[PDB]
Scaffold this active site. Structure first.
Site, short mmCIF file in Angstrom:
data_model
loop_
_atom_site.label_atom_id
_atom_site.label_comp_id
_atom_site.label_asym_id
_atom_site.label_seq_id
_atom_site.Cartn_x
_atom_site.Cartn_y
_atom_site.Cartn_z
N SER A 180 0.68 -1.13 -0.02
CA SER A 180 -0.04 0.00 -0.10
C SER A 180 0.67 1.20 0.07
CB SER A 180 -0.96 0.17 1.31
OG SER A 180 -2.07 1.08 0.75
N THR A 185 -0.57 1.95 -8.49
CA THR A 185 -1.64 2.70 -9.10
C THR A 185 -1.01 3.97 -10.10
OG1 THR A 185 -3.23 2.29 -7.52
CG2 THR A 185 -3.92 3.91 -9.01
N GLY A 451 0.52 -6.75 -3.40
CA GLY A 451 1.63 -7.81 -3.10
C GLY A 451 1.15 -8.64 -1.71
N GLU A 453 0.16 -9.47 1.76
CA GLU A 453 -0.22 -8.54 2.96
C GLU A 453 -0.03 -9.51 4.15
OE1 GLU A 453 -4.46 -7.70 2.66
OE2 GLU A 453 -3.97 -6.02 1.23
N1 AGS Z 1 6.51 8.20 -9.24
C1 AGS Z 1 5.87 8.72 -8.32
N2 AGS Z 1 6.26 10.14 -7.94
C2 AGS Z 1 5.51 10.82 -7.05
N3 AGS Z 1 4.87 9.99 -6.33
C3 AGS Z 1 4.47 9.21 -6.67
C4 AGS Z 1 4.96 8.08 -7.50
N4 AGS Z 1 4.59 6.84 -7.31
C5 AGS Z 1 3.87 7.03 -6.19
N5 AGS Z 1 3.76 8.26 -5.75
C6 AGS Z 1 3.07 8.81 -4.44
O1 AGS Z 1 2.66 7.77 -3.73
C7 AGS Z 1 1.27 7.86 -3.45
C8 AGS Z 1 0.43 6.31 -3.42
O2 AGS Z 1 1.14 5.64 -4.33
P1 AGS Z 1 -0.03 4.73 -5.07
O3 AGS Z 1 0.28 4.63 -6.44
O4 AGS Z 1 -1.47 5.03 -4.72
O5 AGS Z 1 0.29 3.35 -4.17
P2 AGS Z 1 -0.29 1.82 -4.64
O6 AGS Z 1 0.88 1.07 -4.58
O7 AGS Z 1 -1.34 1.83 -5.57
O8 AGS Z 1 -0.99 1.79 -3.08
P3 AGS Z 1 -2.24 0.99 -2.57
O9 AGS Z 1 -3.58 1.42 -3.76
O10 AGS Z 1 -2.80 1.78 -1.22
S1 AGS Z 1 -2.39 -0.92 -2.40
C9 AGS Z 1 0.71 8.62 -4.69
O11 AGS Z 1 -0.68 9.14 -4.37
C10 AGS Z 1 1.94 9.89 -4.72
O12 AGS Z 1 2.18 10.53 -3.60
MG MG Z 2 -3.30 1.59 -5.72
#
Ligand code: AGS
Ligand code: MG
Length: 741
Positions: A180, A185, A451, A453
Site C-alpha cells: 500500500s 496505481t 503484493g 499482505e
Molecule cells: N512516481 C511517483 N512520483 C511521485 N509520487 C508518487 C509516485 N508513485 C507514487 N507516488 C506517491 O505515492 C502515493 C501512493 O502511491 P499509489 O500509486 O497510490 O500506491 P499503491 O501501490 O497503489 O497503494 P495502494 O492502492 O494503497 S495498495 C501517490 O498518490 C503519490 O503521492
Molecule cells: Mg493503488
C-alpha cells in the site's frame, strides 16, 4: 537527441550524471570493503568496513568506530567496486549480496533515480515527491528504444511490451505489485498514458479509456493510514489493439472491493472519496433533493474523525468525477441515480434502532428510513419490515422474525454493502460496455493489485490476496526459469509454492478453502467449529500450517514471503456474504432504474450458488489462465518508509520488501550461476588496458576478451565463453575491475 544531450531533463532526472572522463583510472583505489552489521541484532543495518587483512579463510576489517573485526570470507558481504555504484541493472553487480543490492538502490534513490532493473524486474521506489519524468516529451524519448538503450523507466517497460506485441504477435502482461502506498496505481496510470500516446489514434476512445480510472477511483479508493488515495480493490486492465497496433478498446476486471469500509473506517481514515465528493460538490439544489448535509451529519462519515485530505478538494474532485462520467457516457439519469444511491446508503447508515418493546427492535423515528427509501425508490414500510422483521424459512414454514437491535443493525449494514458492491460492479460493466471490443486482435493487460499482505490482524481477505500472491510468485519463478534457460541455450552456454497453494485451495485432501466451504452449509456452524476442523486436518499434519500455542482463533500459513497468522472471526459470514431475501425483494421493486439493475440482474445480483471463496478461486484461475497466454513483465513497487516521506529510504523497510517480493530470491539464484554476462566488445573497451596486448577497439572482441583474461591468468571456471557475451560468475568481474592498468 536528449539521450545524447547531457543537458536535457532526461539526463537530469533519469541518468547518473556523466563527467568528461570515462577513463578506467579515475576509479582507481587500493582499498577493499565489506558490508557489516554494527549490531547483529539489527540485521538490516550495515556499515561499510574496510578490510584490514585476510587469512587463508576469513576477512578482518575495521568498523566505523575504528573497531576491528573478523569474518569468514565465506560469510562476507563484499562491497562492489565504486564503479558499480548506480548501475542501471542490479544484474550488473559482481557481488550480489543483500546489503549490496540495497546499496545500489539507495545510491540511485539518493539522485532521485527511482527506477532500477533487477534482471527481469523493474524496481520502482516511491519518491514521495514530484519528479517531472512523465511529460509528453518524456513519453517521446522512450519511443522504440531498447531496454538497454534508455534509462530505467515505467515508460521503457511499456515500450518493450508494445514492440513485443507488434513484433511477436503475442499478447503481453505488466504485473505491478507491492505494498500500500508503494505507487502501483501511479505506475499503472503511466503505462496507460504511455500506451495511449504511442498507439492512439493521432482521441475519443483514448479519452474514455483515460476517464475510466478517475471514475473507479472515486468509488473504489479511499484515504487510509498508509495512503491518501488507497485503492480498496484490485484490477486487471486489458488495453485492446487492432492488428495494426492501434488502441481498439479496453476492459477492466475489479477484485476484492473493501465493502466494509462503507460502514466502518479506522480512525484518521476516510470512507470512499465519492461520499465526500458528493457532499462537498452537489448543488445546493441536489442537496435538498438528496436530503444532504455535512459529513459530520452522517454516521458512516462522522466516525474516523477524518473528513478531509490534505491538499485535496472534494468539490473540485467531484467536478472531475462528474466530468469523466460525462465523457465515458453516463446519462444524467444514470448519474443522478448513482448519486441517489450514494445518498441512500448515507441515509441507511443514519437509521437508529432502539429496543424496549421487549427484545425486538423498533424505529421510533423514521426520518432516515424515509430518506433512504425515498432516494432508492423502494417502499419504507417494506423496507422497515425487511430490516427488522425478515421472513425466514424454517423449512416448511416461512415465518417473519423480529430482529433485535444489533442483528437489525448488522442487516442494514449488509444491505448497504450489497448496494455498494453491486453499484461498483455495475459501474464497471457500464464502462466496459463502452470501452470493450469483442473482436480485438491483441492486448496488453495491466494488473494493479497488492503484493503479499502481512498486518497485525490478517483476515479472510488477506488470505485471498496472499493466495493470489503465491500464484503470481510461482508464475514468476516458472517464467524466470524458461527465460533464464532460453538464454544459456542461445549463447551455447551449459513446488514449495505448490504445497502452500494446495494447503489453501486443495480439493482432496481438502485445503483451507474447501473446509471453509463445507462449514458454510450448516446454519449453525461457528468460527470455533471452523477453526477446530482446520486444526483437525492440518495441525502437525501439513508442514505449511501452524496451530498457535495459545490463541484459539488463529492459524498460521507459511507463505512464500514467510508465515502469516490469520484470525478466523466471521469467515463463515464472509464466505456466504448473506443478505435477507426480503431485502432483495424490497429493492427488486425499486422505482429506480439503476437500482432495479443491481437487484434484477443475476450477473450483478448473484455469484453464480457459489461461495465467496469458490468465486475467488475461480476468478484467480481465469486470471492466471490469461496471463499464461501473455509475455509477462514484472514491476516491483517499493515503499521507502512508513511515513510517506521523501529522502528517507529505510533499510529495514526496504529490505523486507525485497525479501518478500522475489527480488532478493531472483538474485540469490542468479548469483549461483553466471550473473554477469557482458558483450565482448564492451568488455574490451573497458579493459583492454589491463593486458599487455589488446587494443580498445578490436574487431576480434571475443579473442580480445580471451587476451586480458589470459593476461590476467583468470580461472576458467570463473567465466564462460558465450557466443555473444562473456559469462562471469560472482566476484570475478569485481576482481577484474580490481586489476592494474
Ligand atoms: N512516481 C511517483 N512520483 C511521485 N509520487 C508518487 C509516485 N508513485 C507514487 N507516488 C506517491 O505515492 C502515493 C501512493 O502511491 P499509489 O500509486 O497510490 O500506491 P499503491 O501501490 O497503489 O497503494 P495502494 O492502492 O494503497 S495498495 C501517490 O498518490 C503519490 O503521492
Ligand atoms: Mg493503488
Amino acid at each position: 537527441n536528449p539521450i545524447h544531450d547531457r543537458t536535457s531533463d532526461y539526463h537530469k532526472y533519469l541518468k547518473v550524471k556523466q563527467g568528461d572522463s570515462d577513463l578506467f583510472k579515475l576509479t582507481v583505489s587500493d582499498k577493499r570493503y565489506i558490508w557489516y552489521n554494527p549490531d547483529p541484532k539489527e540485521r538490516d543495518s550495515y556499515e561499510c568496513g574496510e578490510i584490514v587483512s585476510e587469512t587463508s579463510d576469513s576477512f578482518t576489517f575495521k568498523t566505523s568506530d575504528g573497531q576491528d573485526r573478523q569474518v569468514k570470507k565465506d560469510d562476507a558481504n563484499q562491497r562492489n567496486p565504486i564503479k558499480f555504484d548506480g548501475v542501471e541493472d542490479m544484474s550488473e553487480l559482481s557481488y550480489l549480496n543483500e546489503p549490496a543490492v540495497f546499496h545500489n538502490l539507495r545510491v540511485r534513490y539518493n539522485q532521485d533515480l527511482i527506477y532500477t532493473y533487477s534482471g527481469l524486474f523493474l524496481v520502482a521506489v516511491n519518491p514521495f515527491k514530484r519528479i517531472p519524468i512523465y511529460t509528453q516529451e518524456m513519453v517521446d524519448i522512450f519511443k522504440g528504444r531498447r531496454r538497454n538503450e534508455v534509462a530505467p523507466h515505467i515508460f521503457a517497460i511499456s515500450d518493450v511490451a508494445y514492440r513485443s506485441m507488434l513484433d511477436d504477435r503475442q499478447n503481453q502482461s505488466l504485473l505491478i505489485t507491492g505494498e500500500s502506498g508503494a505507487g502501483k496505481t501511479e505506475n499503472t496510470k503511466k503505462v496507460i498514458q504511455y500506451l495511449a500516446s504511442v498507439a492512439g489514434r493521432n482521441g475519443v476512445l483514448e479519452q474514455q479509456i483515460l476517464q475510466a480510472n478517475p471514475i473507479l477511483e472515486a468509488f473504489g479508493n479511499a484515504k487510509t493510514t498508509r495512503n491518501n488515495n488507497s485503492s480498496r480493490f484490485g484490477k486487471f486492465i486489458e488495453i485492446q489493439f487492432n492488428n495494426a497496433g492501434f488502441i481498439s478498446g479496453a476492459s477492466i476486471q475489479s477484485y476484492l472491493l473493501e465493502k466494509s469500509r462503507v460502514v466502518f473506517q479506522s480512525t484518521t481514515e476516510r470512507n470512499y472519496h465519492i461520499f465526500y465528493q458528493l457532499l462537498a460538490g452537489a448543488t445546493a439544489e441536489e442537496k435538498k433533493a438528496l436530503h444532504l448535509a455535512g459529513p459530520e451529519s452522517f454516521n458512516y462519515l462522522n466516525q474516523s474523525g477524518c473528513v478531509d485530505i490534505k491538499g485535496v478538494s472534494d468539490e473540485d474532485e467531484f467536478k472531475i468525477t462528474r466530468q469523466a462520467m460525462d465523457i465515458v457516457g453516463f446519462s444524467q439519469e444514470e448519474q443522478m441515480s448513482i448519486f441517489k444511491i450514494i445518498a441512500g446508503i448515507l441515509h441507511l447508515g443514519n437509521i437508529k434502532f432502539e429496543k424496549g418493546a421487549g427484545e425486538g427492535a423498533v424505529l421510533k423515528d423514521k426520518t432516515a428510513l424515509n430518506a433512504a427509501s425515498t432516494v432508492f425508490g423502494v417502499n419504507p414500510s417494506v423496507l422497515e419490515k425487511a430490516l427488522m422483521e425478515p421472513r425466514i424459512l424454517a423449512g416448511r414454514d416461512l415465518v417473519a422474525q423480529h430482529l433485535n437491535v444489533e442483528k437489525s443493525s448488522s442487516s442494514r449494514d449488509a444491505l448497504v454493502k450489497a448496494l455498494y458492491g453491486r453499484l461498483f460492479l455495475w459501474l464497471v460493466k457500464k464502462i466496459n460496455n463502452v470501452l470493450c471490443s469483442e473482436r480485438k486482435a491483441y492486448f496488453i493487460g495491466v494488473l494493479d493489485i497488492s503484493g503479499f499482505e502481512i498486518f497485525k490482524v490478517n483476515s479472510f481477505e488477506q488470505l485471498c490476496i496472499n493466495y493470489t500472491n503465491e500464484k503470481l510468485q510461482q508464475f514468476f519463478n516458472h517464467h524466470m526459469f524458461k527465460v533464464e534457460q532460453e538464454e544459456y541455450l542461445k549463447e551455447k552456454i551449459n513446488l514449495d509454492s505448490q504445497a502452500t497453494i494446495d494447503l489453501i485451495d486443495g480439493r482432496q485432501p481438502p485445503g483451507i478453502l474447501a473446509l471453509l466451504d463445507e462449514q458454510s452449509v450448516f446454519p449453525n456452524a461457528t468460527d470455533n467449529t471452523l477453526i477446530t476442523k482446520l486444526h483437525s486436518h492440518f495441525s502437525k499434519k501439513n508442514a505449511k500450517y501452524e496451530e498457535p500455542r495459545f490463541s484459539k482463533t488463529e492459524f498460521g500459513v507459511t507463505h512464500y514471503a514467510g508465515q502469516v497468522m490469520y484470525e478466523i472471526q466471521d469467515w463463515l459470514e464472509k464466505n456466504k456474504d448473506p443478505l435477507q431475501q426480503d431485502l432483495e425483494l424490497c429493492f427488486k421493486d425499486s422505482s429506480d432504474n439503476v437500482v432495479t439493475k443491481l437487484f434484477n440482474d443475476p450477473n450483478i445480483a448473484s455469484r453464480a450458488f457459489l461461495t465467496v471463496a469458490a468465486q475467488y478461486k475461480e476468478q484467480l484461475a481465469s486470471l492466471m489462465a490469461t496471463l499464461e497466454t501473455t509475455n509477462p513483465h514484472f514491476v516491483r513497487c517499493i515503499i521507502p518508509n512508513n511515513k510517506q516521506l521523501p529522502a528517507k529510504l529505510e533499510d529495514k523497510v526496504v529490505l523486507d520488501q525485497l525479501r518478500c517480493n522475489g527480488v532478493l530470491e531472483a538474485i540469490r539464484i542468479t548469483r549461483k550461476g553466471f550473473p554477469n554476462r557482458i558483450i565482448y566488445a564492451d568488455f574490451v573497451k573497458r579493459y583492454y588496458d589491463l593486458a599487455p596486448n589488446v587494443p580498445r577497439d578490436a574487431e576480434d572482441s571475443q579473442k580480445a576478451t580471451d587476451a586480458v583474461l589470459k593476461h590476467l591468468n583468470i580461472d576458467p571456471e570463473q567465466f564462460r565463453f558465450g557466443i555473444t557475451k562473456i559469462f562471469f560468475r560472482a566476484g570475478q568481474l569485481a576482481r577484474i575491475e580490481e586489476a592494474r592498468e
